[PDB]
Structure 1
Amino acid sequence: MAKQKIRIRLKAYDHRVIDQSAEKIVETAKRSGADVSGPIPLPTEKSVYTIIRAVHMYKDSREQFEQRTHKRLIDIVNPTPKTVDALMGLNLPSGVDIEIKL
């Protein structure tokens, strides 16, 4: 669908750090403008790594692992160079992976 817009994606591994950071960049988004979109969730993909507790043998007693990956989705309408600075001004803390986009 056609519209003037900003959109980004975040990624990190902790719902608290990611959602407080979302509170930052939403606050600063509408700080310098309007028409923000909230911190829209995403399915939060996962992984798995099954390993045997072992050195030599005894495969029956296996072990697992995983790496959750939050995903967050934000949009803004009516761009301007100021909310740009709200994007590239504050990501902090920096376990996040921002990819500023249009």
Structure 2
Amino acid sequence: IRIRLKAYEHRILDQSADKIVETAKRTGADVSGPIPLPTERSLYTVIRATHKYKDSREQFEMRTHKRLIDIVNPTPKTVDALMKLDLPSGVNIEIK
């Protein structure tokens, strides 16, 4: 089984990743990771003023930190355990 986790804050992402690994390992399944993936970054530059003044800019960035988890020899209990384990709303989780 493959679990891809994405979040805007690496701190909560690591918390959720540790929870996933802990529950899987407790269930007895083999776990590889967590594996950091190259964080995506996007940049948006906007004129600071509301009229003219092109030279004065401001730049905002959105970062998506991503973690990869691999479960091997997953026991039947692990599937329900991982589906029951609920992450914070700020973390996006994908399975297989």
TM-score by length of 1: 0.88
Shift of 1:62: 0.6
Shift of 1:26: 0.2
Q: Is the 8 A contact 2:30 2:74 kept in 1?
A: no
Q: Distance in 1 between matches of 2:93 and 2:8?
A: 13
Q: Is the 8 A contact 2:42 2:61 kept in 1?
A: yes
| Structure 1 ranges of 4+ moved more than 4 A | none
Which 5+ residue runs of structure 2 have no aligned equivalent? none
Which 5+ residue runs of structure 1 have no aligned equivalent? 1-5
CA RMSD of the aligned region, Å? 1.1
Q: Distance in 1 between matches of 2:81 and 2:34?
A: 15
Q: Secondary structure at the match of 1:69?
A: strand
Give the total of aligned pairs.
96
Aligned to 1:67: 62
Instruction: Give runs of aligned pairs for residues 11-90 of structure 1, distance below 5 A.
Output: 11-90=6-85
Q: Distance in 2 between matches of 1:71 and 1:48?
A: 18
Aligned to 1:98: 93
Shift of 1:53: 0.6
One-letter amino acid of the counterpart of residue 79, structure 1 = P
